[PDB]
Amino acid sequence: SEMNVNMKYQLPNFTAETPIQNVILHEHHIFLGATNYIYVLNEEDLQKVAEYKTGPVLEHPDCFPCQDCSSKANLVWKDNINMALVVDTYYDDQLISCGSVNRGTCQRHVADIQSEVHCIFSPPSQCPDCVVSALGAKVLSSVKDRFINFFVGNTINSSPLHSISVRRLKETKDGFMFLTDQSYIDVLPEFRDSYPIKYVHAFESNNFIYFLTVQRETLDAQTFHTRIIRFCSINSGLHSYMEMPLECILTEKRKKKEVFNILQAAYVSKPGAQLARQIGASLNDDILFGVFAQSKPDSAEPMDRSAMCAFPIKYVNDFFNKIVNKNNVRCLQHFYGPNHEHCFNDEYRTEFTTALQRVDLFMGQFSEVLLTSISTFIKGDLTIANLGTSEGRFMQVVVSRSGPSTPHVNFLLDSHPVSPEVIVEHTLNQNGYTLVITGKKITKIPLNGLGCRHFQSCSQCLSAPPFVQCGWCHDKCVRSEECLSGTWT
Amino acid sequence: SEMNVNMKYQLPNFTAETPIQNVILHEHHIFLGATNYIYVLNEEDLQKVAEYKTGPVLEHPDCFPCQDCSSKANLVWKDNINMALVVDTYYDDQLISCGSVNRGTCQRHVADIQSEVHCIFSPPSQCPDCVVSALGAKVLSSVKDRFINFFVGNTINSSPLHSISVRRLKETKDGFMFLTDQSYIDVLPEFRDSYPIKYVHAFESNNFIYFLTVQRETLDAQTFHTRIIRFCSINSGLHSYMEMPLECILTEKRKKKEVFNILQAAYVSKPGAQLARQIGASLNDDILFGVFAQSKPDSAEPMDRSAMCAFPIKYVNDFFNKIVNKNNVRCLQHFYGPNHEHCFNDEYRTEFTTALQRVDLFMGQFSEVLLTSISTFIKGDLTIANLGTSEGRFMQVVVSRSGPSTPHVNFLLDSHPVSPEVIVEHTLNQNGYTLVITGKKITKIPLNGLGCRHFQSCSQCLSAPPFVQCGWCHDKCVRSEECLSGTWT
Amino acid sequence: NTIHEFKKSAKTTLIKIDPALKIKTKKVNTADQCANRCTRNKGLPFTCKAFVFDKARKQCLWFPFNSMSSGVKKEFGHEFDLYENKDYIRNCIIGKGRSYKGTVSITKSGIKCQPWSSMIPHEHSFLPSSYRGKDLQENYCRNPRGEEGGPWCFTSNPEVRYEVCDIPQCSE
Amino acid sequence: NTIHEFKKSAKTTLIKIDPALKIKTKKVNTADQCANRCTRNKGLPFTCKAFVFDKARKQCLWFPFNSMSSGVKKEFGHEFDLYENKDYIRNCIIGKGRSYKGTVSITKSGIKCQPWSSMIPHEHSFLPSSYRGKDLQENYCRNPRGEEGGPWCFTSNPEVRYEVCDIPQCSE
């Protein structure tokens, strides 16, 4: 009557044996980091080609990380999870992975990608190559001044780690040297126990580094908060370091107010021309797209009420610059401490109060379900997003402020919740595909459509965007060529 | 019940045998010019002292004016009326009279004033000592540059006369020399028959000569008009010669409109402080006070509906200067003629259209009776006028915009209409007297009051101004000293 | 330079009879800065609706109120100059404009109205000192007589003494 | 320099549908002289209530009318700039101000209102291209929703998104 809610379509599909930590696209090869394993696949058909295992390692404190200790009859066998995956292309096309099992001992490998292994250790009071945290971290690298620069947010259990730091790899490719002490920022030991910090996304736009974090609204506030962090990109350290809170809220416009504090995931892109005006942003402009969840009272747990909303990068930059009163700017609580000497007054680190708000783009369409992963692309004028689900359902929606558009593509993928990590590829002629994680199975999904037969009313079929060029065959929504006679509306 | 309208009071009174053309005050002597006679009286008691007759002269064209022709057995005996009287004091205190009987042959006399006679003839195409007209003229003289300058408006029957001219007496005291041709202005012979001109008053203020005239609203307009004429005081001639119409009209203020075109008489003075503000004029400022009558349709006849209204001299000067649009200024019709060469463009003479209006000061108190003579004076703050009547009644009114004040003095003088010519004298201690003409009888009237017994109600007596300090003796308005007991309100 | 726009009562100030009202007082050089500040509510925590400038103290007093707000007392003071907001002066007429006090000062035909207190061209019975109830000031069209025509002014045109001004009535 | 006071509709002009209306047209350099002339009706035989300036012809068109006068057609023209009289803009609200269009552009507390078309700080559904019926322009407090509160604006204050502006109601 309305829509055949779930219909099962078989697509190019790869299944793994362990959950996937990471997915990367580079040069006709698909690089997946799964628990204990490093899979490499053909982009075309999801045929697995080669893999490098990192099986559950033995652990003994006496044994140093890089040199293997198979001679340890006395001690544990512990599983290895890849914290992060990176691909280097400015130098030889190679892959650098880091896992938590070896206290962030990254290893790099220079078709098969398991050709070689290089254990990144540079042997001392502080550890400059204990890179990634174990319980929580985010990594992103980009070529900076011909050296790939690595941005690493870190979570600590209070059990040498820094909350956030930037390190650079020596041309010898052996380890990382912290240029400055302000290249890292640390939480005080007293508060290291409390005030948990988690990272969700990182990227760069317009010569600035942005991280996205969720952590307590204030020290000893017993309440959580979503903030963005921006700072310049200088190899020496974090100089123009600033953060501010973010809020996504929908309410009646003139004067039903609900707020979604907790962020889940995000994606950076360029807009569609129709919506570029819908938000008063230039078509060239880059925009962040965020998916947020509300919290249970004083909890990091996300209830199943989710939303998304967009952010012009210029808008956030301006809010950094001038739009907020200079009085509300406060000291960085968890760095300097409330009883700070410099509080009463390159060098300074700043903390902001009055959060930038944006309204819901789906007017509360998902105040009933929880949302996990996001991806953005354009089709002519139009812009379309591919959403993720806590349940695991997948769907695609034409994003536009001009009314809410029904999901032109919708079904239920595997049992696992949709993982946040996605990679969308656009090839010429507006054909492309999404690479999406669900537990230990990848899925590659076409952009142009997934079978127009999912429609259950003539009006329903009429809402399908013209890029599908699929219509109503007088009793059911199938396209013109498969409409025998011309009675195809 | 209300007021004993007429009560007959006997005052210092002089009676003459012929109508009085002129009345003059100078140096404790009262100079009256009557038909055929020149009376001189004591100022104190109206006791006639001496007189010089000018009896009805014989007329023969062959006989020149000045030399008497008692040898004329062939010819008429015609009455002599003094056109004007003037008193000279800058030179020896002497009296210069002019009558119409001798074609304006003025004669001057250097207690008695008949001491000497000097016939003013200076023997030629134009007559420079045919001074005054016969049927109508106005004369006023003032010491200008140590020579008494004579301003003479003239009426002509179209039967050497000029409409207006200024002449000066030679130190020899023999005749007058016209310095310039523009010292006179003439009506064209074609229109000399029509377009009658009459003069009512002349004076000077602030280095400017003002005449007041009544004459046709325009050439061949078959309608009359009141205008003032102003020009500089230069012995050479009439240079800054201009005229403009005057109108006195009362109507409801916001948006009963009746207009009194015809002027009758006027008086120049300074105001009272209370009314100085009532008109927005400084106390020092000089003000003209005009009495006007309406006309019968296309007539010089005044109907018995009269009014008065005041004019700040600065106001008229400003209207001359700037307040009127330069477009409405028109050529002098009766001088240059409509078909004038200089019309399409010291030297020029000007004529104005949009009349200056002033509202009635008595809000139509006399839309039933006709008014003849006027005089103005002050009593402390207050200002008071002494009116004249076509019937001959006399009255005095406290002039003020703050409501209409009832006539504190009123009665009926002799049968003759009140003549326009008056002389008020103010002596210290606010005692003074008016010298007023009625036919052939003069009357001298005190300023302070004329018998408080003319009141017929307690309210009526209360309106009497305090300068009288006369009140209500509990049954009738008599002052305190003649109120036996203290029951005097 | 909106100071010219706001309406000026010279030698006049206001005192609040209600405690709740808050006045923003600050010394400056000229009333020009008072006008600029009240114009955009510079540092003003309220809806600035008038201000009194004192030359002796050279001090602005800003108000979320003005004369027509209830509970305000008019005080004659030579050192005080009161200024009211035109945009807080109702510029449409209620009835015959009997209470209207806006600054439209041109005839319906489009002629410049003459000053009330002045008598050139036309003298008249209506004067500010005499008529203090209606509070005409220089040229603002009024109907102190409450004439049907509405607020009128005596035209500066010599030819025409008077004319009713043109206001848009609050015709709901 | 009252030109700043009058309300400007850019790229806009008016055409009279009624024959009786008379337009005073004259070429000058800038609309500044148009504004000065219409301000005091310089040589204007009528009650100047608007004027359209044309840059191409550099010509003023003065009108005893404006947009809100009946029988007038709104025309988009890039070379035409329409200017309306504030003193001919009713500055008190009829009901909920549903038709009010005056230029009071400050919150009731006294804060500067943000531009409608702009989205900083706050994005919103209400846009001029979308909402052409109510005809908000830059910052003039409006109630296109007809909210009870009356005309409101989205505050430029980051902390507070929106606030209802303060107007004196035409409370007879």
Author numbering:
A (entry chain C), B (entry chain D): 33 to 107, 111 to 145, 152 to 164, 169 to 204, 210 to 305, 310 to 399, 414 to 557
C (entry chain A), D (entry chain B): 37 to 208
Text lifted from the article:
C-MET receptor, which belongs to the receptor tyrosine kinase (RTK) family, plays essential roles in controlling a number of critical cellular processes such as cell proliferation, survival, motility, and morphogenesis. C-MET can be activated by its cognate ligand—hepatocyte growth factor (HGF). Structurally, the c-MET receptor is composed of a Semaphorin (SEMA) domain, a plexin-semaphorin-integrin (PSI) domain, and four consecutive immunoglobulin-plexin-transcription factors (IPT1-4) domains in the extracellular region, a single transmembrane helix (TM), and an intracellular KD. HGF, the ligand of c-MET, is secreted as a single chain 83 kDa precursor protein containing an N-terminal (N) domain, four consecutive kringle (K1–K4) domains, and a serine protease homology (SPH) domain.
To understand how NK1 activates c-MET, we determined the cryo-EM structure of the 2:2 c-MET/NK1 complex at an overall 5 Å resolution. Due to the structural flexibility, the entire stalk regions of two c-METs in the c-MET/NK1 complex were poorly resolved that the IPT1 and IPT2 domains of c-MET can be only visualized in the cryo-EM map low-pass filtered by local resolutions. In such structural configuration, the two c-METs are placed in relatively close proximity, which enables their intracellular KDs to undergo autophosphorylation and thus initializing the downstream signaling. NK1 engages with c-MET through the K1–SEMA interaction, which is virtually identical to that utilized in the formation of the c-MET II/HGF I complex. We superimposed the model of NK1 dimer onto that of free NK1 dimer, which was previously determined by X-ray crystallography. First, HGF recruits two c-METs in an asymmetrical manner that contrasts with the C2 symmetry observed in c-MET/NK1 complex.
